[PDB]
Design a protein around this nucleic acid. Structure first.
Ligand SMILES: [Mg+2]
Ligand SMILES: [Mg+2]
Ligand SMILES: [Mg+2]
Ligand SMILES: [Mg+2]
Ligand SMILES: [Mg+2]
Ligand SMILES: [Mg+2]
Ligand SMILES: [Mg+2]
Ligand SMILES: [Mg+2]
Ligand SMILES: [Mg+2]
Ligand SMILES: [Mg+2]
Ligand SMILES: [Mg+2]
Ligand SMILES: [Mg+2]
Ligand SMILES: [Mg+2]
Ligand SMILES: [Mg+2]
Ligand SMILES: [Mg+2]
Ligand SMILES: [Mg+2]
Ligand SMILES: [Mg+2]
Ligand SMILES: [Mg+2]
Ligand SMILES: [Mg+2]
Ligand SMILES: [Mg+2]
Ligand SMILES: [Mg+2]
Ligand SMILES: [Mg+2]
Ligand SMILES: [Mg+2]
Ligand SMILES: [Mg+2]
Ligand SMILES: [Mg+2]
Ligand SMILES: [Mg+2]
Ligand SMILES: [Mg+2]
Ligand SMILES: [Mg+2]
Ligand SMILES: [Mg+2]
Ligand SMILES: [Mg+2]
Ligand SMILES: [Mg+2]
Ligand SMILES: [Mg+2]
Ligand SMILES: [Mg+2]
Ligand SMILES: [Mg+2]
Ligand SMILES: [Mg+2]
Ligand SMILES: [Mg+2]
Ligand SMILES: [Mg+2]
Ligand SMILES: [Mg+2]
Ligand SMILES: [Mg+2]
Ligand SMILES: [Mg+2]
Ligand SMILES: [Mg+2]
Ligand SMILES: [Mg+2]
Ligand SMILES: [Mg+2]
Ligand SMILES: [Mg+2]
Ligand SMILES: [Mg+2]
Ligand SMILES: [Mg+2]
Ligand SMILES: [Mg+2]
Ligand SMILES: [Mg+2]
Ligand SMILES: [Mg+2]
Ligand SMILES: [Mg+2]
Ligand SMILES: [Mg+2]
Ligand SMILES: [Mg+2]
Ligand SMILES: [Mg+2]
Ligand SMILES: [Mg+2]
Ligand SMILES: [Mg+2]
Ligand SMILES: [Mg+2]
Ligand SMILES: [Mg+2]
Ligand SMILES: [Mg+2]
Ligand SMILES: [Mg+2]
Ligand SMILES: [Mg+2]
Ligand SMILES: [Mg+2]
Ligand SMILES: [Mg+2]
Ligand SMILES: [Mg+2]
Ligand SMILES: [Mg+2]
Ligand SMILES: [Mg+2]
Ligand SMILES: [Mg+2]
Ligand SMILES: [Mg+2]
Ligand SMILES: [Mg+2]
Ligand SMILES: [Mg+2]
Ligand SMILES: [Mg+2]
Ligand SMILES: [Mg+2]
Ligand SMILES: [Mg+2]
Ligand SMILES: [Mg+2]
Ligand SMILES: [Mg+2]
Ligand SMILES: [Mg+2]
Ligand SMILES: [Mg+2]
Ligand SMILES: [Mg+2]
Ligand SMILES: [Mg+2]
Ligand SMILES: [Mg+2]
Ligand SMILES: [Mg+2]
Ligand SMILES: [Mg+2]
Ligand SMILES: [Mg+2]
Ligand SMILES: [Mg+2]
Ligand SMILES: [Mg+2]
Ligand SMILES: [Mg+2]
Ligand SMILES: [Mg+2]
Ligand SMILES: [Mg+2]
Ligand SMILES: [Mg+2]
Ligand SMILES: [Mg+2]
Ligand SMILES: [Mg+2]
Ligand SMILES: [Mg+2]
Ligand SMILES: [Mg+2]
Ligand SMILES: [Mg+2]
Ligand SMILES: [Mg+2]
Ligand SMILES: [Mg+2]
Ligand SMILES: [Mg+2]
Ligand SMILES: [Mg+2]
Ligand SMILES: [Mg+2]
Ligand SMILES: [Mg+2]
Ligand SMILES: [Mg+2]
Ligand SMILES: [Mg+2]
Ligand SMILES: [Mg+2]
Ligand SMILES: [Mg+2]
Ligand SMILES: [Mg+2]
Ligand SMILES: [Mg+2]
Ligand SMILES: [Mg+2]
Ligand SMILES: [Mg+2]
Ligand SMILES: [Mg+2]
Ligand SMILES: [Zn+2]
Lengths: 113, 59, 46, 104
RNA sequence: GGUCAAGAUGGUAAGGGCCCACGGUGGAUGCCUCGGCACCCGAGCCGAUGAAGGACGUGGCUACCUGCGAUAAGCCAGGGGG
RNA sequence: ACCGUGAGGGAAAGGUGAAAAGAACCCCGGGAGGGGAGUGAAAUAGAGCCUGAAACCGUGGGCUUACAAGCAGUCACGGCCCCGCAAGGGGUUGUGGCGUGCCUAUUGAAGCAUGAGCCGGCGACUCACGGUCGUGGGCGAGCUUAAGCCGUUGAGGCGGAG
RNA sequence: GAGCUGGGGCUAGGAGUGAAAAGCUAACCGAGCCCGGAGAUAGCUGGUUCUCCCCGAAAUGACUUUAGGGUCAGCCUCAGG
RNA sequence: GGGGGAUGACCCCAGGCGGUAGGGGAGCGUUCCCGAUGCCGAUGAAGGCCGACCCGCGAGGGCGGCUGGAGGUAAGGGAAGUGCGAAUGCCGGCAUGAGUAACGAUAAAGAGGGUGAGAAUCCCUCUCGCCGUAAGCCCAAGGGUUCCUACGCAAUGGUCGUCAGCGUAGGGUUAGGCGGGACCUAAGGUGAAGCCGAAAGGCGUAGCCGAAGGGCAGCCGGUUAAUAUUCCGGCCCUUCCCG
RNA sequence: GGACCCGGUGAAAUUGAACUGGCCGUGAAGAUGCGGCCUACCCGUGGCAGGACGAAAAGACCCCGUGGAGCUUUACUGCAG
């Protein structure tokens, strides 16, 4: 049995946030909790929020037992891009993309036999 | 200056090769001498900090 | 530095305004045109 | 919007889930070409905690049905289409089943 | 068993390739249409009795469209219709 | 809309479902979002809604790679993984042999000559009336109607001026 | 001071204005911009999209305001003899 | 090509078969029509995704499985907006460069406390710095709700935001004297009369229109979250009408 | 003050695809890509600018076009005057 939370349309760049997701993958939820608080990146916040919403979803929904949990799977996909004009010298005008992330934490019960 | 430019779009292989150093490393962490939780060393705990002086108060 | 648009409300109505247009055969046709196209504004505003 | 059946009428449901079941047309919606024949084609709507039934989660109401889905009953059996007799002075509906008035 | 000189082969992936699976992104493709297009009929002027086209208004609550004009999402009468 | 002082220029953008039955209520959360519950024939039909291709990005798995050097393939054998009763096949690639991108323009281009970041859509030998050959048929010292006229579930026929 | 400047005005496309640079005339003026003639014309450059089968050239002559374009001839092809 | 005489498709035999410009010949596929009031179809149309399978020289056609949910359309013929890889093509989408340059004046910051889910960035205090013929204040253009206040942070803000010139909603602009008009004329403009011009239209004395100029009567203070020579207080004045 | 490091935000020209070394040769005559030989473990960061005939701009010079425009005159032909 396994539980999952997915944040969608998070306004952040995937490359940036995908980096801290790497940081906690296959970790017991208790270390994963520890790391993200003391990891210095903006995307630590957002990921911890998903981790949690998936911890809750474990015990409260799928009958999981919190102290047995670790991170089975996790990843961030790329939602649609916010495109804004950025005006430039000699009247040029580029377009910057404010990118968007779909964050996914998947939880599992450590074998705990 | 004549404004240099990349000559060939760089390949997936080569950019991801570029990135092979870019992985983060987890924060180095020690158990706090009193409280249940974890703290990074040579620091005062977010919660109930120290002994020899007045710590920031979660006490 | 001093640019080309120097808005002055008197000049605008006196130049592209409805009564300007109706004086000159040329101008009258700009109205006839703008109407036949179905423009929402036959003439600029001020 | 020519229709056929009206509010008073007694109609049969000719097709679908509720096929077979006579009831009375509760209301008639010419804009949608739909009749509401309760009790028939009931459904579960969820609802919030605002006033009456604050505590109440759900409410069973009944859906409209496409007007073509039903037929007037004809106080003999299961049919007809209908016809129109003028006579004197004017106006009508007449069961062609046959042959009856159409009452209320 | 294990000291010891030569030979010799194996796992290892920071990262990367190809294959497979499952997704994200994106909106091609098929189907749908009450919009368009062509021909053929039909029909063909309006205006100082203030036209065409507008402005500003007009709803118990009303941003916009539609309608309508201070009688303002409408007033009177005839025909229709149920 | 937007762009232009103005005349003027001038886009994008359609689809849940048979029916809103458009997801009460609970859980994480500041909201967003998700997870149960529920609805539904179906919910990767959940409103950033039919189908949902490709470039592109990501997770997981198999094979491989840190003393080799290259238009990236190809021919051979061998290793490892998969499928199969077998002989057999699919994947991957260690070594060995061979190997100068596509198109365009040129006497001649891998060319250090043009074009192209990649993918998906759109994108260029037509039509009328004459002509001139050929071909399939009708009639043949003849052949053939035009306008129009009658007639017609998309029915034809008449008409000999030329 | 042949000064600078606000407000109101007039002059324009072979036309204006110019203490004259062919300057300026709404951010490119040896002839403004817009819409139209209009799909002007382009002996030039580029591009021209499925598959299989047979044959298979020329880059020479003559004339050409012709020379990187044509017309006739030559060389390819297909049908009948 | 020559036999076999099926009158050719079938069978032997024998030869030819590199190819650009280009000529010839066979086919494949796409959209539509007849075939069709038919046939296939929810026991699943078109389209999609796989196949190591079958047929075809090839373009293709089959078949099987998954997806998909309402269309499809034989044999045989007809008609064309019929096949893309290139045009610095057109339209869209998404990459590379790259977590790179940059984040817009070198006037300059620091701490405490508050608020809040969250604070370098919001509020208050103290300290420090900068402008001061301004980088302060008042008017005209021009802009047009940006004003004041309550709630708010998706986006806009080059970071952040609890803040805002941003979203929602409510409120706010008070004049006989200030500015303009029921006054004047200026350049110009328009124009009875008049004149000229194929048409359109061009001119023109009077008049009329036209202003930051001429003419004309309000000064000081208080008040609101937001207006004040406009409301209020006090002190003054103008023009019309009628006695 | 930048540049460098960390946290936040995050462009651009360019880009056939790349698994993109040196020499002596060869080749459309100036080779990362062909031959022979030499050299070379995989991947980055800060730096220099010699090469990719580096980017940009369908060379402005030059010639071609029976292309265009401005200008001249005792070129031709007209028109105003
Ligand atoms: Mg700049
Ligand atoms: Mg600018
Ligand atoms: Mg310089
Ligand atoms: Mg100045
Ligand atoms: Mg402008
Ligand atoms: Mg003014
Ligand atoms: Mg309108
Ligand atoms: Mg009937
Ligand atoms: Mg790794
Ligand atoms: Mg999607
Ligand atoms: Mg009207
Ligand atoms: Mg209205
Ligand atoms: Mg009536
Ligand atoms: Mg009546
Ligand atoms: Mg009646
Ligand atoms: Mg405008
Ligand atoms: Mg929710
Ligand atoms: Mg169910
Ligand atoms: Mg779900
Ligand atoms: Mg699906
Ligand atoms: Mg679906
Ligand atoms: Mg989408
Ligand atoms: Mg549907
Ligand atoms: Mg979908
Ligand atoms: Mg995809
Ligand atoms: Mg992988
Ligand atoms: Mg060695
Ligand atoms: Mg090795
Ligand atoms: Mg290498
Ligand atoms: Mg090899
Ligand atoms: Mg080319
Ligand atoms: Mg060339
Ligand atoms: Mg050449
Ligand atoms: Mg040459
Ligand atoms: Mg090249
Ligand atoms: Mg090259
Ligand atoms: Mg070159
Ligand atoms: Mg060239
Ligand atoms: Mg394409
Ligand atoms: Mg086409
Ligand atoms: Mg012909
Ligand atoms: Mg013929
Ligand atoms: Mg014949
Ligand atoms: Mg005859
Ligand atoms: Mg002046
Ligand atoms: Mg002026
Ligand atoms: Mg001119
Ligand atoms: Mg001067
Ligand atoms: Mg302009
Ligand atoms: Mg200029
Ligand atoms: Mg000229
Ligand atoms: Mg052209
Ligand atoms: Mg012409
Ligand atoms: Mg010419
Ligand atoms: Mg042309
Ligand atoms: Mg040959
Ligand atoms: Mg020649
Ligand atoms: Mg030529
Ligand atoms: Mg010839
Ligand atoms: Mg043979
Ligand atoms: Mg051949
Ligand atoms: Mg059947
Ligand atoms: Mg079809
Ligand atoms: Mg299904
Ligand atoms: Mg299918
Ligand atoms: Mg075409
Ligand atoms: Mg091509
Ligand atoms: Mg270019
Ligand atoms: Mg593009
Ligand atoms: Mg880009
Ligand atoms: Mg990048
Ligand atoms: Mg940084
Ligand atoms: Mg760099
Ligand atoms: Mg740097
Ligand atoms: Mg920097
Ligand atoms: Mg700054
Ligand atoms: Mg607090
Ligand atoms: Mg001073
Ligand atoms: Mg103003
Ligand atoms: Mg503005
Ligand atoms: Mg404010
Ligand atoms: Mg507030
Ligand atoms: Mg915000
Ligand atoms: Mg922001
Ligand atoms: Mg506001
Ligand atoms: Mg006046
Ligand atoms: Mg005049
Ligand atoms: Mg005058
Ligand atoms: Mg006057
Ligand atoms: Mg005045
Ligand atoms: Mg005055
Ligand atoms: Mg006054
Ligand atoms: Mg005062
Ligand atoms: Mg104020
Ligand atoms: Mg005021
Ligand atoms: Mg007073
Ligand atoms: Mg060399
Ligand atoms: Mg090679
Ligand atoms: Mg070779
Ligand atoms: Mg070499
Ligand atoms: Mg470097
Ligand atoms: Mg260099
Ligand atoms: Mg440099
Ligand atoms: Mg150089
Ligand atoms: Mg150039
Ligand atoms: Mg050139
Ligand atoms: Mg020059
Ligand atoms: Mg010439
Ligand atoms: Zn009956």
């Amino acid at each position: 049995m396994e539980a999952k939370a997915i944040a969608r349309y998070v306004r952040i760049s995937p490359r940036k946030v995908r980096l801290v997701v790497d940081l906690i993958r296959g970790k017991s939820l208790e270390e994963a909790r520890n790391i993200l608080r003391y990891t210095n990146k903006r995307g630590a916040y957002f990921v911890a929020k998903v981790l949690e919403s998936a911890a809750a979803n474990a015990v409260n929904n799928h009958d999981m037992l919190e102290d047995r949990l670790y991170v089975k799977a996790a990843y961030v996909d790329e939602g649609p891009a916010l495109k804004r004009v950025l005006p430039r010298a000699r009247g040029r005008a580029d377009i910057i993309k404010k990118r968007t992330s779909h964050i996914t934490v998947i939880l599992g019960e450590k074998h705990g036999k | 200056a004549k404004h240099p430019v990349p000559k060939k779009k760089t390949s997936k292989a080569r950019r991801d090769a570029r990135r092979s150093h870019h992985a983060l490393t987890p924060p180095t962490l020690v158990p706090c001498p009193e409280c249940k939780a974890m703290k990074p060393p040579h620091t005062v705990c977010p919660e109930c900090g120290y002994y020899a002086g007045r710590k920031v108060l979660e006490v | 530095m001093k640019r080309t648009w120097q808005p002055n409300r008197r000049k605008r109505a006196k130049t592209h305004g409805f009564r300007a247009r109706m004086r000159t055969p040329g101008g009258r046709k700009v109205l006839k045109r703008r109407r036949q196209k179905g423009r929402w504004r036959l003439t600029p505003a001020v | 919007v020519k229709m056929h059946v009206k509010k008073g009428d007694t109609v049969l449901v000719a097709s679908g889930k509720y096929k077979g079941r006579v009831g009375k047309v509760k209301e008639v919606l010419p804009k949608k070409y739909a009749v509401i024949v309760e009790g028939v084609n009931i459904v579960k709507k969820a609802v919030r905690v605002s006033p009456k039934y604050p505590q109440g989660g759900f409410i069973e109401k009944e859906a409209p049905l496409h007007a073509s889905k039903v037929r007037p009953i004809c106080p003999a059996c299961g049919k007809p289409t209908r016809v129109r007799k003028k006579f004197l002075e004017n106006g009508k509906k007449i069961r062609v089943c046959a042959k009856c008035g159409g009452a209320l």
